[PDB]
Structure 1
Amino acid sequence: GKKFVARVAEAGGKRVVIIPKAERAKVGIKVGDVVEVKKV
């Protein structure tokens, strides 16, 4: 339930939210994890 703020970016012709290593460590996110994305 921990969260972080980010910006939608364009990478490889896709709209993505890049998750830096620091943010992964703070929120406890690994590849494959399910997340909730909310527009602010």
Structure 2
Amino acid sequence: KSVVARVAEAYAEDVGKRIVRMDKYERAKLGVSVGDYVEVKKV
């Protein structure tokens, strides 16, 4: 399944870390858990 989400900016401490922050709803809808890798592209 594919989840659409709106891009928000990173917190200063996260700038540079190659992470994507998403909540438990988008994580359950994707089938991923914290530490997994996901593919992101522009709508």
TM-score for the superposition, normalised by structure 2: 0.61
Question: Once the two structures are superposed, what CA deviation does each residue of 1:4-38 show, in whole Å capped at 9, x if it has no partner?
Answer: 00111013134x75422111112111111111101
Q: Aligned partners of 1:6, 1:29: CA distance in 2, in Å?
A: 15
Between the two proteins, the alignment pairs up a number of residues equal to: 38
> Where does the alignment leave 5 or more consecutive residues of structure 2 unmatched?
none
**Percentage of matched positions with identical amino acids:** 63
Higher helix share: 2
- Higher RCO (C-alpha 8 Å, min separation 6): 2
Higher strand share: 1
Q: Which runs of 4+ in 1 moved over 3 A?
A: none
